[PDB]
């Protein structure tokens, strides 16, 4: 129902493992998300970091979604006609890492995490489609 249709649509093709819609305005809240996974824990702290003015310090400092450490690969989050930030996660030691894209609509972030070895390119495309679907539902 409602916002979950979108999440579940994104999870449908085999290729991703978390996803989530978070309304960024006023106080940032999760509108829908994959149950009991990382994005469901995104905090107002880390959304403000995705939406704030400074667009460099995160490249050196890194950042977190939920409490998961992430490297910002390509930021065009606030840029007209692009709306995307690509990222990839960080593991201590040997664990795998995964790509992430976030796409900003009028009121929303769309967050998608690929599975292991899934190309940040496919992730970027999908997460951009869905967010375009949202963006002409005037959201």
């Amino acid at each position: 129902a409602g916002w979950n249709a979108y999440i579940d649509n994104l999870m449908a093709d085999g290729t991703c493992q978390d996803a989530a819609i978070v309304g960024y305005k006023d106080s940032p809240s999760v509108w829908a998300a994959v149950p009991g996974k990382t994005f469901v824990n995104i905090t107002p702290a880390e959304v403000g970091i995705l939406v704030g003015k400074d667009r460099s310090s995160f490249f050196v400092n890194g950042l977190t979604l939920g409490g998961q450490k992430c490297s910002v690969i390509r930021d065009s989050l606030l840029q007209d006609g692009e709306f995307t930030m690509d990222l990839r996660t960080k593991s201590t030691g040997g664990a795998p890492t995964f790509n992430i894209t976030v796409t900003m609509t009028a009121k929303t972030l769309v967050l998608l995490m690929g599975k292991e070895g899934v190309h940040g390119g496919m992730i970027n495309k999908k997460c951009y489609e869905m967010a375009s679907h949202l963006r002409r539902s005037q959201y």
Binding site: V60, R74, D75, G121, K125
Partner: protein
């Protein structure tokens, strides 16, 4: 199956993927048409790519045309092509390249890979920082698991040509003359056979006089001989000291470092343990030792620093893309005619990074 195409400020390299080496290496020049190697072999009677960026599409088009019909003599709509591009290539440009592929050449699938990324891959890594000097431009490109970090990428507008220019400036400052480019193939080949990189420049210059081996001799075509001395090392030193060329910029060693400094702290060590040199202009004897020392000086005294210079590093980019475009994983990565019909030229922005 897949075609690989490396387009350079001066040299183009094309071939099939799975091949160990290209199958057409030719100058990136047009002048019936006059393209590539038929240009610099019937010279008397434009460089479409400039500092790695394409500046002229009709030309660029005609090179590709040449690449397919006259060079690789193959059918473009039968083959998924991997094209390479420069770090920070402007956006309208990645689009027009995509447009021209699927629409003019009607290709079935295509990808655009940052040149540096192939080279890092050619060496069996996915994290590292790569110094790539060709002919028109030099870039430093930090990389994390196969993804270039554009914010920390640096661009130094001096490579091969600037150094051929510089050698021809000093050699003429001595007396000799060259102003026809038939007489420049020459100075280029001198630069290539004889130039090297001083481990310590000042000490190299101050002890130059106790020569023994420094000195060398080169017979020009017109029978004439030239004596070459501290030029052997002085011209390539402009790579570390671009003041030698009149410009106010940092050298490759301080640039690499400057790139490492704009990256995420948690991979800096990994970038210092994995600095990879590529491109024709990194071919100089000594450059690795020199980069090693230069950055061991710039870094914390505890940073482990490995400079890596692979012996095939002039073809690292193309070798790199032959390996990549030949993996199965690569089709879940490519861009199809259908995706192209669905979404237009814009799709490069999403899919290639």
């Amino acid at each position: 199956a897949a075609l690989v195409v490396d387009n350079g400020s001066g040299m183009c390299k094309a071939g099939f993927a799975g091949d160990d080496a290209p199958r057409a290496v030719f100058p990136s020049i047009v002048g019936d048409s006059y393209v590539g190697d038929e240009a610099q072999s019937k010279r008397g009677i434009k460089y479409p790519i400039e500092h790695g960026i394409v500046t002229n599409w009709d030309d660029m088009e005609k090179i590709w045309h040449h690449t397919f019909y006259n060079e690789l003599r193959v059918a473009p709509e039968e083959h998924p092509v991997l094209l390479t591009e420069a770090p920070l290539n402007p956006k309208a440009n990645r689009e027009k390249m995509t447009q021209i592929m699927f629409e003019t050449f009607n290709t079935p699938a295509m990808y655009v890979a940052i040149q540096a990324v192939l080279s890092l891959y050619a060496s069996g890594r996915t994290t590292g920082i790569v110094m790539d000097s060709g002919d028109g431009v030099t870039h430093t490109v930090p990389i994390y698991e196969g993804y270039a970090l554009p914010h920390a990428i640096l661009r130094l507008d001096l490579a091969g040509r600037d150094l051929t220019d510089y050698l021809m400036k000093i050699l003429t400052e001595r007396g000799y003359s060259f102003t026809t480019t038939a007489e420049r193939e020459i100075v280029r080949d001198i630069k290539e056979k004889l130039c090297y990189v001083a481990l310590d420049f000042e000490q190299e210059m101050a002890t130059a006089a106790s020569s023994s081996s420094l000195e060398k001799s080169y017979e020009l075509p017109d029978g004439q001989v030239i004596t070459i001395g501290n030029e052997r090392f002085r011209c390539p030193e402009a790579l570390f000291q671009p003041s030698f060329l009149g410009m106010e910029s940092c050298g490759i060693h301080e640039t690499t470092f400057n790139s490492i400094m704009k990256c995420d702290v948690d991979i800096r060590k990994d970038l210092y343990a994995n600095t990879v040199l590529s491109g024709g202009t990194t071919m100089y004897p000594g450059i690795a030792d020199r980069m090693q020392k230069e950055i061991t000086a710039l870094a914390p005294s505890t940073m482990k620093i490995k400079i890596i210079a692979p012996p095939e590093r002039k073809y690292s980019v193309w070798i790199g893309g032959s390996i990549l475009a030949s993996l199965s994983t690569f089709q879940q990565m490519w861009i199809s005619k259908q995706e192209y019909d669905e979404s237009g030229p814009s799709i490069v922005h999403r899919k290639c990074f």
